[PDB]
């Protein structure tokens, strides 16, 4: 279906999860948050292996 | 502003510019496949968007 | 002889930076550390500032 609608907002400083922001944000903040969740935050209730 | 018997040096003010848009934006454009994201429907996303 | 302007010597730095700016902006177009240390956190400032 033509759908008449298309978006390209995931490329740049827009929504755009660009490599620099993804690298820094993930590898620092989400790493710390995941270690905190695993350690004393919970394994079977919070963000789990799945 | 160039005449024989004197300096006729012209700066490459925009040569460097175009040689800066080439690599950075060429590589950001050719960064995996994040160029497109249809913002898919909730009912079906794998069959039509990705 | 007539006195030079006290910054012609530093004018080479700008042209050096420029023709590095063309393709080889890296300092000396080479990498060397003798006393400074590189710290690995996540691909060590990932992939050396993304190549």
């Amino acid at each position: 279906a033509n759908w008449r609608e298309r978006s390209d907002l995931t490329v740049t400083v827009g929504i755009g999860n660009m490599n620099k922001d993804q690298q820094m944000l993930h590898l620092m903040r989400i790493w710390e948050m995941a270690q905190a969740v695993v350690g004393g935050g919970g394994l079977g209730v919070l963000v789990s292996e799945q | 502003n160039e005449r024989p018997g004197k300096s006729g040096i012209v700066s490459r003010d925009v040569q460097e510019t175009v040689d800066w848009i080439m690599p950075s934006l060429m590589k950001v454009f050719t960064s995996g496949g994040q160029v497109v994201k249809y913002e898919p429907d909730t009912a079906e996303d794998v069959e039509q968007a990705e | 002889t007539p006195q030079l302007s006290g910054e012609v010597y530093g004018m080479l730095d700008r042209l050096e930076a420029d023709r590095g700016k063309r393709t080889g902006i890296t300092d000396r177009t080479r990498g060397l550390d003798q006393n400074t240390l590189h710290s690995n956190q996540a691909a060590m400032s990932v992939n050396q500032l993304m190549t």
Side-chain angles (χ1 to χ4, degrees), chain A, chain B residues 4-5 8-50, chain C:
Chain A
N2 200 348
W3 188 30
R4 196 81 170 100
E5 289 166 2
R6 185 196 267 254
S7 76
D8 268 355
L9 289 168
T10 315
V11 182
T12 45
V13 194
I15 298 171
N17 275 336
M18 53 175 209
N19 284 318
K20 287 79 64 180
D21 275 345
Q22 293 298 102
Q23 282 152 340
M24 307 214 80
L25 187 153
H26 288 344
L27 289 151
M28 281 185 138
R29 187 55 251 158
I30 209 166
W31 259 90
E32 294 155 350
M33 191 195 78
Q35 285 196 357
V37 159
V38 166
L43 304 175
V45 182
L46 261 180
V47 170
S48 60
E49 279 204 346
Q50 293 275 35
Chain B
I9 307 156
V10 169
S11 56
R12 311 225 179 214
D13 296 330
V14 294
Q15 282 281 100
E16 57 194 312
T17 68
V18 301
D19 298 357
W20 300 335
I21 296 89
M22 295 299 102
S24 187
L25 292 183
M26 186 66 204
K27 290 184 185 174
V28 167
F29 264 97
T30 51
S31 55
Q34 60 179 354
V35 192
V36 189
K37 261 287 151 176
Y38 289 166
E39 283 208 29
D41 266 339
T42 304
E44 40 174 359
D45 49 359
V46 187
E47 200 195 355
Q48 69 96 29
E50 71 95 22
Chain C
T1 59
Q3 313 171 338
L4 317 180
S5 64
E7 212 52 38
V8 286
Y9 302 82
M11 290 309 128
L12 207 54
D13 294 337
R14 188 59 42 78
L15 287 194
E16 284 173 346
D18 281 3
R19 86 291 183 276
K21 180 64 66 68
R22 175 62 201 85
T23 49
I25 311 183
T26 44
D27 200 8
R28 279 47 192 160
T29 66
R30 258 190 156 175
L32 263 169
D33 277 331
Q34 278 191 152
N35 279 333
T36 47
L37 308 194
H38 288 286
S39 53
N40 299 318
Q41 51 184 3
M44 192 295 297
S45 181
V46 181
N47 274 343
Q48 290 162 327
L49 296 158
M50 321 165 278
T51 71

PDB file of all heavy atoms in Angstrom, chain C residues 2-18:
ATOM      1  N   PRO C   2      65.587  45.276   8.034  1.00  0.00           N
ATOM      2  CA  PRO C   2      64.307  45.689   8.625  1.00  0.00           C
ATOM      3  C   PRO C   2      63.708  44.605   9.511  1.00  0.00           C
ATOM      4  O   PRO C   2      63.798  43.410   9.218  1.00  0.00           O
ATOM      5  CB  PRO C   2      63.421  45.970   7.402  1.00  0.00           C
ATOM      6  CG  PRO C   2      64.158  45.395   6.226  1.00  0.00           C
ATOM      7  CD  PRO C   2      65.602  45.481   6.577  1.00  0.00           C
ATOM      8  N   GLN C   3      63.098  45.042  10.610  1.00  0.00           N
ATOM      9  CA  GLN C   3      62.585  44.119  11.612  1.00  0.00           C
ATOM     10  C   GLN C   3      61.370  43.362  11.094  1.00  0.00           C
ATOM     11  O   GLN C   3      60.491  43.932  10.442  1.00  0.00           O
ATOM     12  CB  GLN C   3      62.217  44.876  12.887  1.00  0.00           C
ATOM     13  CG  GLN C   3      63.279  45.850  13.360  1.00  0.00           C
ATOM     14  CD  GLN C   3      62.788  46.735  14.486  1.00  0.00           C
ATOM     15  OE1 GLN C   3      61.585  46.922  14.663  1.00  0.00           O
ATOM     16  NE2 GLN C   3      63.719  47.286  15.256  1.00  0.00           N
ATOM     17  N   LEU C   4      61.324  42.068  11.394  1.00  0.00           N
ATOM     18  CA  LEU C   4      60.182  41.242  11.040  1.00  0.00           C
ATOM     19  C   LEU C   4      59.038  41.452  12.021  1.00  0.00           C
ATOM     20  O   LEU C   4      59.244  41.825  13.180  1.00  0.00           O
ATOM     21  CB  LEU C   4      60.567  39.763  11.025  1.00  0.00           C
ATOM     22  CG  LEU C   4      61.898  39.420  10.366  1.00  0.00           C
ATOM     23  CD1 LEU C   4      62.143  37.920  10.419  1.00  0.00           C
ATOM     24  CD2 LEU C   4      61.901  39.932   8.941  1.00  0.00           C
ATOM     25  N   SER C   5      57.821  41.212  11.544  1.00  0.00           N
ATOM     26  CA  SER C   5      56.680  41.134  12.442  1.00  0.00           C
ATOM     27  C   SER C   5      56.811  39.902  13.326  1.00  0.00           C
ATOM     28  O   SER C   5      57.180  38.820  12.862  1.00  0.00           O
ATOM     29  CB  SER C   5      55.376  41.086  11.647  1.00  0.00           C
ATOM     30  OG  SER C   5      55.313  39.916  10.856  1.00  0.00           O
ATOM     31  N   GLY C   6      56.497  40.065  14.608  1.00  0.00           N
ATOM     32  CA  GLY C   6      56.786  39.036  15.587  1.00  0.00           C
ATOM     33  C   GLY C   6      55.876  37.825  15.562  1.00  0.00           C
ATOM     34  O   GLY C   6      55.779  37.108  16.563  1.00  0.00           O
ATOM     35  N   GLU C   7      55.208  37.572  14.435  1.00  0.00           N
ATOM     36  CA  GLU C   7      54.324  36.417  14.340  1.00  0.00           C
ATOM     37  C   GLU C   7      54.422  35.663  13.021  1.00  0.00           C
ATOM     38  O   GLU C   7      53.652  34.717  12.821  1.00  0.00           O
ATOM     39  CB  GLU C   7      52.866  36.845  14.578  1.00  0.00           C
ATOM     40  CG  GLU C   7      52.008  35.783  15.254  1.00  0.00           C
ATOM     41  CD  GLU C   7      52.628  35.250  16.531  1.00  0.00           C
ATOM     42  OE1 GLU C   7      53.232  36.044  17.284  1.00  0.00           O
ATOM     43  OE2 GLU C   7      52.516  34.030  16.779  1.00  0.00           O
ATOM     44  N   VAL C   8      55.334  36.037  12.118  1.00  0.00           N
ATOM     45  CA  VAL C   8      55.510  35.270  10.887  1.00  0.00           C
ATOM     46  C   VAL C   8      55.928  33.841  11.197  1.00  0.00           C
ATOM     47  O   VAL C   8      55.588  32.909  10.459  1.00  0.00           O
ATOM     48  CB  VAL C   8      56.528  35.961   9.958  1.00  0.00           C
ATOM     49  CG1 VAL C   8      55.919  37.191   9.321  1.00  0.00           C
ATOM     50  CG2 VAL C   8      57.785  36.331  10.728  1.00  0.00           C
ATOM     51  N   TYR C   9      56.672  33.644  12.287  1.00  0.00           N
ATOM     52  CA  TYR C   9      57.081  32.302  12.682  1.00  0.00           C
ATOM     53  C   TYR C   9      55.880  31.432  13.029  1.00  0.00           C
ATOM     54  O   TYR C   9      55.843  30.250  12.670  1.00  0.00           O
ATOM     55  CB  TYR C   9      58.053  32.379  13.863  1.00  0.00           C
ATOM     56  CG  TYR C   9      59.292  33.208  13.586  1.00  0.00           C
ATOM     57  CD1 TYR C   9      59.267  34.595  13.694  1.00  0.00           C
ATOM     58  CD2 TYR C   9      60.485  32.604  13.214  1.00  0.00           C
ATOM     59  CE1 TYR C   9      60.395  35.354  13.438  1.00  0.00           C
ATOM     60  CE2 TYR C   9      61.619  33.356  12.957  1.00  0.00           C
ATOM     61  CZ  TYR C   9      61.567  34.729  13.071  1.00  0.00           C
ATOM     62  OH  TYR C   9      62.692  35.481  12.818  1.00  0.00           O
ATOM     63  N   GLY C  10      54.887  31.998  13.717  1.00  0.00           N
ATOM     64  CA  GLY C  10      53.673  31.270  14.032  1.00  0.00           C
ATOM     65  C   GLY C  10      52.702  31.110  12.884  1.00  0.00           C
ATOM     66  O   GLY C  10      51.711  30.387  13.027  1.00  0.00           O
ATOM     67  N   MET C  11      52.957  31.766  11.749  1.00  0.00           N
ATOM     68  CA  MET C  11      52.104  31.610  10.578  1.00  0.00           C
ATOM     69  C   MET C  11      52.256  30.244   9.921  1.00  0.00           C
ATOM     70  O   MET C  11      51.358  29.826   9.182  1.00  0.00           O
ATOM     71  CB  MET C  11      52.398  32.709   9.555  1.00  0.00           C
ATOM     72  CG  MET C  11      51.954  34.094   9.990  1.00  0.00           C
ATOM     73  SD  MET C  11      50.235  34.108  10.529  1.00  0.00           S
ATOM     74  CE  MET C  11      50.384  34.894  12.130  1.00  0.00           C
ATOM     75  N   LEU C  12      53.368  29.545  10.167  1.00  0.00           N
ATOM     76  CA  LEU C  12      53.506  28.185   9.659  1.00  0.00           C
ATOM     77  C   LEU C  12      52.551  27.226  10.352  1.00  0.00           C
ATOM     78  O   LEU C  12      52.127  26.234   9.748  1.00  0.00           O
ATOM     79  CB  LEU C  12      54.943  27.694   9.826  1.00  0.00           C
ATOM     80  CG  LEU C  12      55.355  26.626   8.814  1.00  0.00           C
ATOM     81  CD1 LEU C  12      55.093  27.119   7.404  1.00  0.00           C
ATOM     82  CD2 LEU C  12      56.809  26.229   9.000  1.00  0.00           C
ATOM     83  N   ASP C  13      52.212  27.497  11.614  1.00  0.00           N
ATOM     84  CA  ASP C  13      51.298  26.623  12.339  1.00  0.00           C
ATOM     85  C   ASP C  13      49.942  26.557  11.651  1.00  0.00           C
ATOM     86  O   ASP C  13      49.331  25.485  11.566  1.00  0.00           O
ATOM     87  CB  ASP C  13      51.140  27.105  13.781  1.00  0.00           C
ATOM     88  CG  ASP C  13      52.422  26.992  14.581  1.00  0.00           C
ATOM     89  OD1 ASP C  13      53.287  26.169  14.214  1.00  0.00           O
ATOM     90  OD2 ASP C  13      52.563  27.727  15.581  1.00  0.00           O
ATOM     91  N   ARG C  14      49.454  27.694  11.156  1.00  0.00           N
ATOM     92  CA  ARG C  14      48.144  27.714  10.517  1.00  0.00           C
ATOM     93  C   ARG C  14      48.135  26.896   9.230  1.00  0.00           C
ATOM     94  O   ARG C  14      47.203  26.122   8.989  1.00  0.00           O
ATOM     95  CB  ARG C  14      47.717  29.153  10.243  1.00  0.00           C
ATOM     96  CG  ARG C  14      46.287  29.276   9.766  1.00  0.00           C
ATOM     97  CD  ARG C  14      45.319  28.699  10.785  1.00  0.00           C
ATOM     98  NE  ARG C  14      45.670  29.073  12.151  1.00  0.00           N
ATOM     99  CZ  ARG C  14      45.418  30.257  12.693  1.00  0.00           C
ATOM    100  NH1 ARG C  14      44.819  31.217  12.008  1.00  0.00           N
ATOM    101  NH2 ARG C  14      45.780  30.484  13.952  1.00  0.00           N
ATOM    102  N   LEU C  15      49.163  27.048   8.392  1.00  0.00           N
ATOM    103  CA  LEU C  15      49.216  26.266   7.159  1.00  0.00           C
ATOM    104  C   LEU C  15      49.423  24.786   7.451  1.00  0.00           C
ATOM    105  O   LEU C  15      48.900  23.927   6.729  1.00  0.00           O
ATOM    106  CB  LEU C  15      50.320  26.787   6.242  1.00  0.00           C
ATOM    107  CG  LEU C  15      50.064  28.125   5.551  1.00  0.00           C
ATOM    108  CD1 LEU C  15      51.078  28.329   4.448  1.00  0.00           C
ATOM    109  CD2 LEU C  15      48.649  28.192   5.005  1.00  0.00           C
ATOM    110  N   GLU C  16      50.201  24.470   8.490  1.00  0.00           N
ATOM    111  CA  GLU C  16      50.353  23.081   8.909  1.00  0.00           C
ATOM    112  C   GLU C  16      49.006  22.489   9.302  1.00  0.00           C
ATOM    113  O   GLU C  16      48.634  21.392   8.859  1.00  0.00           O
ATOM    114  CB  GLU C  16      51.349  22.991  10.064  1.00  0.00           C
ATOM    115  CG  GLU C  16      52.802  23.123   9.640  1.00  0.00           C
ATOM    116  CD  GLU C  16      53.747  23.191  10.821  1.00  0.00           C
ATOM    117  OE1 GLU C  16      53.266  23.400  11.955  1.00  0.00           O
ATOM    118  OE2 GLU C  16      54.969  23.032  10.620  1.00  0.00           O
ATOM    119  N   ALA C  17      48.246  23.226  10.114  1.00  0.00           N
ATOM    120  CA  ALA C  17      46.909  22.787  10.487  1.00  0.00           C
ATOM    121  C   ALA C  17      46.018  22.647   9.262  1.00  0.00           C
ATOM    122  O   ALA C  17      45.181  21.747   9.202  1.00  0.00           O
ATOM    123  CB  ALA C  17      46.297  23.761  11.493  1.00  0.00           C
ATOM    124  N   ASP C  18      46.187  23.523   8.269  1.00  0.00           N
ATOM    125  CA  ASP C  18      45.339  23.467   7.079  1.00  0.00           C
ATOM    126  C   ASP C  18      45.617  22.222   6.237  1.00  0.00           C
ATOM    127  O   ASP C  18      44.690  21.489   5.865  1.00  0.00           O
ATOM    128  CB  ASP C  18      45.526  24.734   6.244  1.00  0.00           C
ATOM    129  CG  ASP C  18      44.757  25.917   6.803  1.00  0.00           C
ATOM    130  OD1 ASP C  18      44.125  25.765   7.869  1.00  0.00           O
ATOM    131  OD2 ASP C  18      44.781  26.996   6.175  1.00  0.00           O
TER     132      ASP C  18
END
